[PDB]
């Protein structure tokens, strides 16, 4: 109807606003990098192994992403990139040969919903798929080249959920114990360390059916293996502990906001801070000493948000991804603190800069340890983007 031509207008609008963004950065920024992918992906993650050759300023980093396509066969791709780690320069910083080299492909069926390695062994990965079972692949075993017959080996594949789901989380402390949330209202668990080679298929060691509503967000509390959290489209999060024989009777539960919530995040450096976003433009945090009480809220967003990560190496900073084609960040040490009247129209002092120079949808961002300042991007328009924040804004 009208929106058809109204959205037809917006491609013009977003094009030059992005173009405006693109000339905003060079005079105001440190490192603009990007790449054009082949097929859209939903999961973006860096390979934590970093090879930094001495003298060669281009610090080599690697990426992990899934694959989603229209009607072809998806795969599993592992990316790489070398980036200038030095500041004295002005290919521009190195050779003209190139800084991004990617050749790894392992066949994947369906679209990669949530593919993440387990922290104690990156070679062990669980991939959430539209199918019931959970694909398990290893880069060490699987060839970098695609199988010409299209036959992958999702050996030792997990199962326990009869439908697809969003939110795949291994235990940061335990090994082989993963939390999976699917359309089955259930939370499944495994014990891979106790699982030998049994028919290349794994079923859930234990299943938790807390939410009556569809579970779409589950993650261990990153500080404790005993406790672990779950968030669903029931407009409320649901916190869990271990030794819950009543796998539907949780540890804690309370309403957070007035719309669908499917993202959570807990403070690494503070053992008692839990911050989650919500689709109703709100970002908020909670203190463990008050389950039903929210420390503060940040409604400044503009669309749905389900990707929140606590910025590493810094406690008073948290980064996020939003469906408004915008990426925001907040300061936790300046909550409503002193700010100039000129600051007021730009935003509260706790609020920090808004990224979002995107020509397509991005609702997934990631980093790796030792690199708090770098972000990967994946979009529907087959785009990778890497950016390194200017520090003069900070000090």
């Amino acid at each position: 109807k009208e929106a058809a031509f109204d959205d037809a207008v917006e491609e013009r609008v977003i094009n030059e606003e992005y173009k405006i963004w693109k000339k905003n950065t060079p005079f105001l920024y440190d490192l603009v990098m990007t790449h054009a992918l082949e097929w859209p992906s939903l999961t973006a993650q860096w390979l934590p192994d970093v090879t930094r050759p001495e003298g060669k300023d281009f610090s080599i980093h690697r990426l992990v992403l899934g694959t989603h396509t229209s009607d072809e066969q998806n795969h599993l791709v592992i990316a790489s990139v070398q980036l200038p780690n030095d500041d004295a320069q002005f290919g521009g910083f190195g050779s003209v040969s190139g800084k991004i080299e990617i050749e790894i492909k392992i066949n994947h069926e369906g679209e990669v919903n949530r593919a993440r390695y387990m922290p104690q062994n990156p070679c062990i990965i669980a991939t959430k798929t539209p199918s019931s079972d959970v694909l398990v692949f290893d880069y060490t075993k699987h060839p970098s080249k695609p199988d010409p017959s299209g036959e992958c080996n999702p050996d030792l594949r997990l199962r326990g959920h009869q439908k697809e789901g969003y939110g795949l989380s291994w235990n940061p402390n335990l090994s082989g114990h993963l939390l999976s949330a699917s359309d089955d209202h259930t939370i499944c668990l495994w014990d891979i360390s106790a699982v030998p080679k049994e028919g290349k298929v794994v079923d859930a060691k234990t299943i938790f059916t807390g939410h009556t509503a569809v579970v779409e967000d589950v993650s261990w509390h990153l500080l404790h293996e005993s406790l672990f959290g779950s968030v669903a489209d029931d407009q409320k999060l649901m916190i869990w502990d271990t030794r819950s024989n009543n796998t539907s009777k949780p540890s804690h539960s309370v309403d957070a906001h007035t719309a669908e919530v499917n993202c959570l995040s807990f403070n690494p450096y503070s053992e008692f801070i839990l911050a989650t976003g919500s689709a109703d433009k709100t970002v908020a945090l909670w203190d463990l000493r008050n389950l039903k009480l929210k420390l503060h809220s940040f409604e400044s967003h503009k669309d749905e948000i389900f990707q929140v990560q606590w910025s590493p190496h810094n406690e008073t900073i948290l980064a996020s991804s939003g469906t408004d084609r915008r990426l925001n960040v907040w300061d936790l040490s300046k909550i409503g603190e002193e700010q100039s009247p000129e600051d007021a129209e730009d935003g509260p002092p706790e609020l920090l800069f808004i990224h979002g120079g995107h020509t397509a949808k991005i609702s997934d961002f990631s980093w790796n340890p030792n690199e708090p300042w770098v972000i990967c991007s994946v979009s529907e328009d087959n785009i990778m983007q890497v950016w390194q924040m200017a520090e003069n804004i900070y000090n």
Partner: protein, 126 residues
């Protein structure tokens, strides 16, 4: 190249890159640009940054103390949630101009639904 310059490596006589702009959307925009510029006076009275409001009272409210209230609707039809006022600030709010930044989150599309222009508009696929 080690000697790579700024992003201005072009000549002053190159062919145009065929700008993505089209005339039709501008035609709708300019009629749109002027229509609320008459209702909201964004460019006339607000100079492209503010919106005028001429108050229209709804109801009356009185306290025992020295306080009487006048709930104020505003004529431009794209207004804030109405508030009650006293006779002291009455006959003064008859023409109130409010800058765009001070406008609440609701005003994102109240001035015009295409200001944000939600691209998906439906849950076709997550």
């Amino acid at each position: 190249n080690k000697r790579r310059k700024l992003k201005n490596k072009r000549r002053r006589s190159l062919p145009r890159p065929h700008d993505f702009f089209d005339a039709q959307t501008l035609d709708a925009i300019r009629h749109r640009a002027i229509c609320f510029n008459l209702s909201a006076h964004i460019e006339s009275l607000g100079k492209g940054h503010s919106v005028v409001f001429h108050s229209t009272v709804i109801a009356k409210r009185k306290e025992d103390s020295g306080k009487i209230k006048l709930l104020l609707h505003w004529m431009p039809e794209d207004i804030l949630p109405d508030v009650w006022v006293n006779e002291s600030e009455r006959h003064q709010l008859k023409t109130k101009v409010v800058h765009l930044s001070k406008l609440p989150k609701d005003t994102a599309l109240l001035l015009d639904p295409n200001i944000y222009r939600t691209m998906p508009q439906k849950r076709l696929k997550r």
